[PDB]
Structures are given as C-alpha cells and as structure tokens.
C-alpha cells in the first residue's frame, strides 16, 4: 500500500507535484479562435479539479520512455540558451518600464491592503497604545524631570 501511493503521487502531475489559476472555458475558447494549446488547456482544467471536471483516465512507464526518447532528440547549446534568456530578460524589463484598465486593479489591490493592513495597524496600535500610552506617560513625565533637574543644576552652579 506504501508502494501504490508512491506510484500515484509521482505520476499524478509534474507541475502539481513540484510547485506553483482560475477556471476559464472562455479563455480556452478565445485562445483557440493551435491544437497543442487546446491540449494543455484541458490538462490544466482536469488537474485543478464556471468549471466542469471530466478527464480522469490518462495520466508511469509510458512517460519514462517518452522522456528518454525526447532527451535523445535534444557548449553551443549552452550559449544559445544564455543568449535567448538575456533577450527574454530585456523583453521583461521593457514591458515593466512602459507601464510605470490596469491601473484600476492596482488601486483595488491597495484598497484590500489598506483595509487588511490598516485594520491590523489599528489593532496593533490600539493594543500597543493601551499598554504603551501608560508607559509613554511614565517615560514622558520622567523626561520633564530632567528639564527641571537641569534648570536647578545651573542656578546652583551659578550661585556656587
């Protein structure tokens, strides 16, 4: 039973098992309007389970042979990947510099933050304030004592 669980978890999905989406049949309909793109779209909707689930009889030995075969088909290869990675990095820095529709989403993201954060701030503040306004008065009324302990000091030194 331990062996069977080891076979199902590994052969469940490569992306899902490793690490990190909303359901969109209209996005799959819009993207098609080419065949390989539709195959990955249905694959994403199946694993995730306006969303219907269905595909559950497709996804270990057939995948290993498929991976070994594709590896055979694939210094010079290392430089062509480093050059393309720099080109995509320049395209990512260019798409970011132009922005700084889209502006309304960021403001609403802040309104969530402003809400979530400032509510936390006000709770952290009022919790602190209750404990620390007393200690502020304690600390601040002590500071006033230095200002009188100093002013007398000088008059005594002067008179001395």
């Amino acid at each position: 039973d331990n062996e069977r669980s080891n076979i199902k978890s590994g052969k469940q999905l490569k992306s899902r098992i490793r690490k990190f989406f909303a359901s969109l049949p209209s996005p799959k309909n819009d993207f098609e309007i080419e065949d390989e793109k539709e195959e990955d779209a249905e694959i994403a909707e199946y694993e995730k389970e306006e969303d219907n689930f269905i595909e559950p009889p497709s996804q270990p030995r057939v995948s290993l042979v498929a991976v070994p075969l594709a590896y055979s088909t694939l210094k010079n290869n290392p430089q062509s990947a480093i050059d393309n990675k720099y080109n995509l990095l320049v395209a990512n820095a260019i798409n970011k510099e132009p922005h700084m529709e889209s502006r309304m989403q960021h403001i609403t993201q802040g309104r969530t933050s402003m809400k979530i954060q400032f509510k936390t701030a006000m709770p952290p503040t009022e919790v602190l304030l209750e404990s620390i306004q007393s200690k502020v008065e304690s600390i601040e009324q002590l500071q006033r004592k230095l200002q009188h302990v100093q002013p007398l000091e000088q008059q005594n030194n002067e008179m001395c």
Partner: protein, 58 residues
C-alpha cells in the same frame, strides 16, 4: 533664514491623499502606498513581538 522668517520648508504632502482612476502619475502614487503599507505592517510586527518589554527596558 528659516528661524528668522518663522517658516519651515514644506514636505511631501502627497502619499496621504491620492485618488483612484487617476493616470500614470497616480499609478505611481498608488504603488507607493502599497510598498510603504507593507513596510508599515512589517514595522508594526517587530514592535508588537517584543511589545512592552522594549519600552519598559528604556
């Protein structure tokens, strides 16, 4: 000159007000409010962790 005239130089009264559906200018001003509010909420976390122990020690 500041003391004689009795006038302090004005600071950035901008972050507090802002406005939604603005422009590229308020897109910046909005993104400013987020990062500083996250810094704020992180700046309140390390205070509350110690809490009153750090205050009473001083």
């Amino acid at each position: 000159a500041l003391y004689t005239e009795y006038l302090k130089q004005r600071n950035n009264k901008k972050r507090r007000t802002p406005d939604f559906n603005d422009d590229d200018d308020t897109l910046f001003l909005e993104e400013y409010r987020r990062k500083y509010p996250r810094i704020d909420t992180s700046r309140y976390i390390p205070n509350e962790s110690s809490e009153v122990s750090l205050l009473g020690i001083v």
